[PDB]
Design a protein around this ligand. Structure first.
Ligand SMILES: CCCCCCCCCCCC(=O)O
Ligand SMILES: CCCCCCCCCCCC(=O)O
Ligand SMILES: [Ca+2]
Lengths: 39, 250, 177, 269, 25, 250, 269, 177, 25
């Protein structure tokens, strides 16, 4: 669950690719994939 | 030598019998447009009532002397036939009575099954005394021949089976519709009776047109382990009719 | 008894003098314990069924042993009957053993819809209770117990539909060639 | 194909007892509703069409899964499969047919290829399936001459081609297929259906020449029966199947487990 | 030729026994 | 302009009405030999059941919002029809519904009487919640529109009359068999309904084919001393049929 | 199927008043244009063909969206779905049928697969859809025997194959489907259409064996009704649907919202 | 009144002695407030419509209460009528309440084209104003107000076409199973 | 067999009830 691409914003469960990283849609269950963005 | 009776959703059988006898020789039937007095449409529950209702078995032993139930009544709790019976004032019906009681090629006994019209018992006391309603309407249980004092007992029917409970001698009991169950032969009796009474219809509560009687004329002897066999009674109304419908009485 | 013939018969006692229940079962063809039977198993291959069922009983006691039972079918919509009275108020048959060992009786098809599900849920198609009408009886010097078997089959009536996969048989992991 | 209707019945009180019979005979007491209950009159519609043999075994099911693993290196020396033909390998199906002693029918075979990708791309795959009858030469290398198929019947499948399918006439040298068989060999050995049901073998082999992607081909096989007849029904199976062409059921340290559920007492179900 | 069931046409396009569709009853 | 209905030993009259309406336009009748599935002789109690049964009057005031009873059920205690209903598994019937309610030339109001098939109410809560049996089987009493908390109340049907109790708008309620009672005109409504349901017969206990609804669409105003009139409901089954007879259930 | 025409009318001045009636009856005052206005004579063409039930529910709509997420690792233990069958889950449709109390009809089901790619490539995907009737064994692993489908009806879809589709006969054990149902269980529980409309479940499972690309399969389900009949119309729905097989409408801290718009005053619209 | 029956009736006053407007509404079947009605809702399922409409009114006051209204339909192409005169110059009906509570009147189909859009824009199919022809009147000791209901239905005439998705009902976010 | 509407041919190619196209009126 790495390979430098796919990676959930969570310590466990599965993994979500880089395309949904701070995009506005919530993908990983924890909701951390969208936490502390806005740069 | 065999037999199979069907009524409503019920069916009796009997590997060995004395070919059923028909009461006074007149099959049941409904009420003639030419006799009736009740001037309202009678209700005919049909298969939901003209079925086979089985009682509560009593036990026959080396010392029992007899039993008896009155009809209608006895059925007063048996479903729709029962209900209807109280919901209406007037009722009319004839039934089929199958008395079963198996045993063994190694026994011996003999019961007299008699169906009797207008069976008026007699209290067992001297002087102005009658019989109490409550005692002539036992229910699916029946009244047994018990010799051992009763209660508010002066309203008690006598306990003198051998006098048919009325001043006649058992032995002339045959003058009525009856069959015999003789263990060494058959193992069941069967009576089919029409409606007998001097009027179209009568009150199901206040009067018992019939009255079933069973008397061991022959001591139930045996050498086997089982020295007590049960006797069961199954009954099925036929062509049931009710009139004057109102509230259910208690 | 679970894995022996004894599961297929029942035992009657000469020492029971009274209206006692003997056994009972649900009706729904694909239920327990019917499901394992011919008819059953097959019904288990479809989804809907309809028809009348033919239950037969064979008494196996001694030749001088005699009895009088009462096979009864109580239509769904209520609860299993606890007393004889409560039972016989439905469709029944007072069977008397004598010479012919058998006796078949029928469970009329009495449903609301025309067809019913092979695999029920919490629903039912009634039960068949069986009681002592009289009492088992024997002479001196005889086994105080007797066996009672039970068969089932469909009537001219019976019929199935909706092909589906049976549930009474599985395959967990490959088979060797 | 219809079902009779139910006639209205009436309160009998006869000397004849149709209800009472004797199962000792081996006959199924022919009693009908009417004979035992004042019944109604019903005009049944119900149809048994569906319950016909042709509707039963008339459905396609799976009988085999042939997994082939491609191997770059020694290409022409492997990358091919074989298979002892028979229905005995897949419960579902087997249980059914094993519902009759003998059966006769034609068959509709249908294939289902699945290419599990192992490199980033698949390229262009092309399979071949040859039916090799008993007696014919079996292939032994992705490049054996046998795959020329000058007479055997082969069917080619390539990627993006709809599932292939074909029909097969009732084989066997008898009047019908043996579902069971209490017999042996001419050398008193091999008790079992194996003794006969030798239909030959089914083989495949990737055709696409030596290439670059490691991949897995998984071809499932489905079979529907047509134009059917069957004789002498048997009681259905009760325990998991263990081995082909044999009835055996006892399994390595595990109880004999049926499908019959247990209960506490018989006076309550 | 076309028939009735539980109308429609259907001729066998194939030259062989087995290729035919399902039987009738 | 007048009317007289007879059923069993009962007869309704009404000096002033809007000529009775027939449900979906199909008079009641028994079960066709061509449809039935129940393969046993049905019982037809006749006049002892297909009579007029009168409920328990409710009161209409300057603030009532509505009421409703479900059918069958409501009758579950009304004599033979009642009894039979429980003694059997299957039942079938259509009835005649006469809603009476007189007043005076010096009043004004308007009720909507609607008969509805398969009336599935909705509980008044959010999330996985259903309705409790006990609450959809009130009995001859009915269910009133009361705004003031209930018990183990999360199994309670909503109390939103104006949405027909189901997510539809009162005002399209007319799409069903219905009449109007408008004090200034008539003083009684009458509906006759056949048996509607997707099967021959159904269980009298576990399902209510119909459901009577009454909603004051027009405030009951007046200047007279009596500012509260009662509303009575009388019902009569027609062509009653029962199947699968066994013991009485509780 | 035509509409009558409009006849020319003339200035009546009669003792009979057809305009005046009484809605208390429960009848829809049968008055026509002519009776109330010196009218013209028109030869109407208009046709009600379209308004037939068969034209109404005769259109395919969506009833379910089954999303399946493939998971490399534990492949054979997941990557499969299930579904309680029913129309109750998709307003659009549901609202319509819920326009009648009872309805009868056959159905045309149509599938629509969408593979959302998650790696750079998709490879070769292949789905399977099995219809499991109530009573049949439900699958429990991408590799359960049930998927053999010796009798259930399954349909296979692979990538690049046109949308699949099939027809279905009116199921149910009744004369018609229950759109509503004021009844309960034999255990006085579950008030609702749920009490009956148990059609079983629909399952899918990716077939392609273990592979390399993580992907998402989204198969939508469309349904058209055919050969129709319906009884007892009901008033249409008015509030968002909340739960299947129940009428409920009250929602978590939010007003009861219809579709009726409000206005300032009634003497101006 | 918005979420109670009271939205379905109207109120007449015994204290209004003059040609006063009572209420009015657009005609276009799928307009407000018609849209929520049987006919309405359904029309909302198609695109084009055509036919005559049947409007019925039922008076609910006391039995001794009497009045004389005036239901009127003013053909599109103009503006809602402000005075009685201005109104009755079109198609109308002087309804007198007496014994029969009801009275139905019709809105002839009077368009340019043969069919019209279910969902209008800024366009119209006319309005139905309603006025006091005389005056509500009562005796002594009676409610000074009376209710007036209103129904609608299509004529033998009426007809729809062009199947489309209704707009009077939505689904925002999934439904629970 | 072929008919008129609101001519053309149409036979049911399928052996079963449900498979047929839309009904007539
Ligand atoms: C080329 C495809 C092979 C399919 C062969 C079907 C033959 C079935 C014969 C049954 C033999 C058995 O008992 O297993
Ligand atoms: C295999 C595809 C499944 C489609 C099933 C259509 C069945 C519709 C029956 C209506 C039941 C309900 O009220 O929800
Ligand atoms: Ca995201």
């Amino acid at each position: 669950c790495r390979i430098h691409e796919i990676s959930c914003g969570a310590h466990s469960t599965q993994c979500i690719p880089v395309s949904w990283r701070c995009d506005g849609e919530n993908d990983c269950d924890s909701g951390e994939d969208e936490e502390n963005c806005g740069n | 030598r065999i037999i199979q009776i069907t009524r409503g959703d019920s069916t009796i059988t009997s590997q060995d019998v004395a070919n059923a006898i028909v009461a006074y020789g007149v099959w049941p039937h409904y009420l003639s447009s030419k006799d009736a007095s009740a001037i309202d449409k009678p209700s005919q529950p049909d298969t939901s009532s003209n079925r086979f209702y089985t009682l509560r078995s009593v036990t026959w032993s080396s010392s029992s002397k007899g039993w008896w139930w009155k009809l209608p009544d006895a059925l007063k709790d048996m479903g729709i036939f029962g209900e209807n019976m109280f919901y209406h004032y007037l009722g009319r019906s004839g039934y089929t009575i199958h008395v079963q009681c198996n045993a063994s090629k190694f026994h011996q006994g003999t019961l007299i099954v008699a169906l009797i019209p207008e069976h008026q018992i007699a209290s067992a006391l001297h002087g102005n005394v009658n019989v109490g309603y409550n005692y002539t309407h036992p229910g699916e249980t029946g009244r047994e021949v018990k010799a051992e004092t009763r209660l508010n007992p002066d309203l008690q029917p006598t306990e003198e089976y051998w006098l048919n409970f009325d001043g006649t001698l058992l032995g002339n009991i045959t003058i009525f519709p009856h069959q015999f169950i003789n263990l060494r032969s058959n193992n069941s009796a069967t009576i089919i009776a029409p409606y007998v009474n001097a009027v179209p219809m009568d009150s199901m509560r206040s009067h018992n047109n019939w009255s079933l009687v069973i008397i061991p004329i022959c001591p139930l002897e045996t050498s086997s382990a089982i020295n007590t066999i049960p006797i069961t009674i199954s009954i099925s109304p036929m062509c049931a009719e009710f009139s004057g419908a109102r509230a259910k009485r208690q | 008894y679970i894995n022996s013939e004894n599961m297929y018969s029942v035992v009657l006692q000469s020492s029971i003098n009274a209206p006692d229940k003997i056994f009972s079962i649900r009706t729904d063809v694909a239920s327990q314990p019917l499901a394992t039977t011919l008819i059953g198993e097959i019904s288990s291959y479809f989804t809907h069924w309809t028809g009348s069922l033919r239950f037969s009983f064979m008494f196996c006691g001694t030749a001088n042993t005699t009895v009088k039972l009462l096979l009864a079918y109580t239509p769904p919509g209520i609860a299993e009957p606890t007393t004889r009275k409560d039972a016989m108020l439905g469709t029944h048959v007072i069977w008397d053993v004598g010479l012919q060992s058998t006796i078949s009786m029928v469970v009329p098809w009495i449903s609301a819809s025309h067809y019913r599900n092979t695999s029920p849920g919490r629903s039912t198609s009634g039960y068949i209770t069986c009681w002592y009408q009289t009492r088992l009886v024997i002479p001196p010097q005889t086994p105080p117990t007797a066996r009672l078997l039970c068969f089932v089959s469909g009537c001219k009536d019976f019929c199935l539909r909706m092909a589906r996969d049976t549930n009474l048989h599985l395959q967990s992991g490959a088979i060797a060639q | 194909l219809v079902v009779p209707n139910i006639n209205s019945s009436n309160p009998t009180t006869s000397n004849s007892a149709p209800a009472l019979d004797a199962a000792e005979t081996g006959h199924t007491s022919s009693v009908q509703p009417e004979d035992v209950i004042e019944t109604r009159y019903v005009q049944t519609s119900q149809t048994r069409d569906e319950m016909s043999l042709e509707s039963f075994l008339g459905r396609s099911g799976c009988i085999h899964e042939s997994k082939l693993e491609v191997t770059l290196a020694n290409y022409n020396k492997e990358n091919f499969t074989v298979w002892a033909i028979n229905l005995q390998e897949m419960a579902q199906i087997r249980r059914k047919f094993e519902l009759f002693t003998y059966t006769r029918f034609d068959s509709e075979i249908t294939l289902v290829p699945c290419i599990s990708a192992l490199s980033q791309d698949i390229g262009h795959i092309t399979m071949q399936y040859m039916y090799v009858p008993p007696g014919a030469p079996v292939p032994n290398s992705r490049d054996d001459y046998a795959w020329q198929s000058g007479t055997n019947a082969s069917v080619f499948w390539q990627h993006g081609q709809a599932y292939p399918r074909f029909s097969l006439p009732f084989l066997s040298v008898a009047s019908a297929y043996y579902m069971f068989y209490d017999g042996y060999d001419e050398q008193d050995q091999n008790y079992g259906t194996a003794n006969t049901n030798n239909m030959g073998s089914l083989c495949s082999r990737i055709v696409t020449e030596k290439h670059i992607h490691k991949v897995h081909i998984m071809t499932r096989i489905y079979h529907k029966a047509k134009h059917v007849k069957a004789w002498c029904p048997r009681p259905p199976r009760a325990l998991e199947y263990t081995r082909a062409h044999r009835t055996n059921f006892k399994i390595e340290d595990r109880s004999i487990q049926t499908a019959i559920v247990t209960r506490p007492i018989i006076t309550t179900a | 030729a076309q028939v009735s069931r539980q109308n429609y046409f259907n001729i066998n396009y194939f030259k062989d026994a087995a290729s035919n569709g399902a039987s009738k009853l």
